[PDB]
Design an enzyme around this catalytic site. Sequence first.
Site, PDB file in Angstrom:
ATOM      1  N   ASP A 271      -2.198   7.911  12.152  1.00  8.09           N
ATOM      2  CA  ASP A 271      -0.905   8.371  12.526  1.00  8.09           C
ATOM      3  C   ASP A 271      -1.290   9.163  13.870  1.00  8.09           C
ATOM      4  OD1 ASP A 271       0.099   9.330   9.181  1.00  8.09           O
ATOM      5  OD2 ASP A 271      -0.399   7.279  10.129  1.00  8.09           O
TER       6      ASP A 271
ATOM      7  N   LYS B 196       1.438  -2.858   8.988  1.00  4.79           N
ATOM      8  CA  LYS B 196       2.524  -1.941   8.907  1.00  4.79           C
ATOM      9  C   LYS B 196       3.674  -2.755   9.684  1.00  4.79           C
ATOM     10  CE  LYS B 196       3.939   2.840  10.636  1.00  4.79           C
ATOM     11  NZ  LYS B 196       3.286   3.998  11.425  1.00  4.79           N
TER      12      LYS B 196
ATOM     13  N   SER C 260       6.404   1.051   6.072  1.00  4.10           N
ATOM     14  CA  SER C 260       5.891   0.228   5.098  1.00  4.10           C
ATOM     15  C   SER C 260       4.612  -0.603   5.358  1.00  4.10           C
ATOM     16  CB  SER C 260       7.305  -0.897   5.065  1.00  4.10           C
ATOM     17  OG  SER C 260       7.159  -1.698   3.771  1.00  4.10           O
ATOM     18  N   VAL C 261       3.737  -0.450   4.554  1.00  7.57           N
ATOM     19  CA  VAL C 261       2.347  -0.938   4.715  1.00  7.57           C
ATOM     20  C   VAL C 261       1.753  -1.812   3.678  1.00  7.57           C
ATOM     21  CG1 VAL C 261      -0.184  -0.154   5.088  1.00  7.57           C
ATOM     22  CG2 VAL C 261       1.789   1.336   6.136  1.00  7.57           C
TER      23      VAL C 261
ATOM     24  N   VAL D 237       0.956  -1.212  -0.032  1.00  4.39           N
ATOM     25  CA  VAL D 237       0.068   0.090  -0.107  1.00  4.39           C
ATOM     26  C   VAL D 237       0.901   1.023  -0.041  1.00  4.39           C
ATOM     27  CG1 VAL D 237      -1.574   1.453   1.461  1.00  4.39           C
ATOM     28  CG2 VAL D 237      -2.152  -0.988   1.181  1.00  4.39           C
TER      29      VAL D 237
HETATM   30  O1  LIG Z   1      -7.527   2.106   4.900  1.00  7.44           O
HETATM   31  C1  LIG Z   1      -6.788   2.296   5.638  1.00  7.44           C
HETATM   32  N1  LIG Z   1      -6.731   1.829   7.069  1.00  7.44           N
HETATM   33  C2  LIG Z   1      -5.622   1.655   7.757  1.00  7.44           C
HETATM   34  N2  LIG Z   1      -4.637   2.126   7.301  1.00  7.44           N
HETATM   35  N3  LIG Z   1      -3.423   2.175   8.322  1.00  7.44           N
HETATM   36  C3  LIG Z   1      -2.293   2.705   7.748  1.00  7.44           C
HETATM   37  S1  LIG Z   1      -0.940   2.461   8.922  1.00  7.44           S
HETATM   38  C4  LIG Z   1      -1.243   1.205  10.326  1.00  7.44           C
HETATM   39  C5  LIG Z   1      -1.306   1.966  11.557  1.00  7.44           C
HETATM   40  C6  LIG Z   1      -1.692   1.125  12.456  1.00  7.44           C
HETATM   41  C7  LIG Z   1      -1.682  -0.235  12.221  1.00  7.44           C
HETATM   42  F1  LIG Z   1      -2.118  -1.387  13.245  1.00  7.44           F
HETATM   43  C8  LIG Z   1      -1.567  -0.854  11.086  1.00  7.44           C
HETATM   44  C9  LIG Z   1      -1.241  -0.068  10.030  1.00  7.44           C
HETATM   45  F2  LIG Z   1      -1.037  -0.532   8.600  1.00  7.44           F
HETATM   46  C10 LIG Z   1      -2.124   2.967   6.598  1.00  7.44           C
HETATM   47  C11 LIG Z   1      -3.163   3.088   5.817  1.00  7.44           C
HETATM   48  C12 LIG Z   1      -4.236   2.777   6.158  1.00  7.44           C
HETATM   49  C13 LIG Z   1      -5.615   2.984   5.273  1.00  7.44           C
HETATM   50  C14 LIG Z   1      -5.420   3.224   3.774  1.00  7.44           C
HETATM   51  C15 LIG Z   1      -5.250   2.587   2.565  1.00  7.44           C
HETATM   52 CL1  LIG Z   1      -5.100   0.868   2.933  1.00  7.44          CL
HETATM   53  C16 LIG Z   1      -5.155   3.144   1.371  1.00  7.44           C
HETATM   54  C17 LIG Z   1      -5.286   4.246   1.253  1.00  7.44           C
HETATM   55  C18 LIG Z   1      -5.393   5.263   2.396  1.00  7.44           C
HETATM   56  C19 LIG Z   1      -5.649   4.793   3.573  1.00  7.44           C
HETATM   57 CL2  LIG Z   1      -5.521   5.957   4.828  1.00  7.44          CL
END
Ligand SMILES: O=c1ncn2nc(Sc3ccc(F)cc3F)ccc2c1-c1c(Cl)cccc1Cl
Length: 330
Positions: A155, A40, A24-25, A23
């Site tokens: 965040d 993440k 380091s994610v 998506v």
């Molecule tokens: O929908 C989401 N839901 C969660 N996150 N979390 C994270 S980071 C994170 C934080 C806490 C966790 F336990 C785990 C993590 F990965 C990053 C993006 C994200 C999205 C997302 C996606 Cl998949 C695409 C485009 C925009 C966003 Cl905001």
Amino acid sequence: RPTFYRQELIWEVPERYQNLSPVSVCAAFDTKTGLRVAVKKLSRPFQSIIHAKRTYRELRLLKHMKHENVIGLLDVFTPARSLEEFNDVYLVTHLMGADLNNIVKCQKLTDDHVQFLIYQILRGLKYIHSADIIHRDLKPSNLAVNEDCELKILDFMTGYVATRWYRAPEIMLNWMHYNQTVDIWSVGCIMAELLTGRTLFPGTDHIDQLKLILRLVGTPGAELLKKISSESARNYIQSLTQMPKMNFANVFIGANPLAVDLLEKMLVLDSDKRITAAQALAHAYFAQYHDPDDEPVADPYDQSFESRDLLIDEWKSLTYDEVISFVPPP
Ligand SMILES: O=c1ncn2nc(Sc3ccc(F)cc3F)ccc2c1-c1c(Cl)cccc1Cl
Ligand SMILES: [Cl-]
């Protein structure tokens, strides 16, 4: 302990997590819950003391947050079998699939979508602020939104950049020691943009953005100048020609006048006099969504670790303890 498998995108995750793609994610399918998840990986987490403290801070924050409108922890794991090999932290949460930028681009929003969307930020913010936590960096990209328009907060800076457009003036310019209403300024900026489709203060730099801000809200009066403890900053503001506050009904033409009212309460230059999340939820604008019985506060959050100076290994041992003691939600 579950079975782990390895793959390069190197990711070593329990076999419950499948169909990992970047998506380091990473996005994944959790086969235990049936939920799509964001995973993440914290790669160099115990590199310096600064880094080791940041990992511990992140884990603590995420472990504490148990609210529908705040990103929480579904799981936290390490492939490591002991403290001695411990060197990776993986964090799992609900995947929403898009942020708030990926939402105004796709659809035109009603005053109703704005209501529901802002209500949810303030509801999660009431919760975060109740644990004496300040987000500090609320922006549309830190707001995760799904298809049902449900929202979670995540965040927790030079030139024509979105990174700065939502910051309260007092933080952007280190005016004073700031409170939690810096987050309320951010919500104001976000809300305005939802109503107009345009950035509220898209400054080309810090000074330009301050000018944009002061043009709308007026230059600081005598009392707020006193509260600006940065003598350098106070001295610059006073060089500016005084401007009064603009009429917000003339800036936000055609908006729900209740929405205009709430923006005026949110975008007050003096942070002491901004509306809080608890108060904003009770505002007439959210009459449709507001339920004082379904707007919970947080448990006590002990952040006394913030004042503590510890060596790398101590922050890392603390982080480890926090990993192994994690109990999943249910
Ligand atoms: O929908 C989401 N839901 C969660 N996150 N979390 C994270 S980071 C994170 C934080 C806490 C966790 F336990 C785990 C993590 F990965 C990053 C993006 C994200 C999205 C997302 C996606 Cl998949 C695409 C485009 C925009 C966003 Cl905001
Ligand atoms: Cl724009």
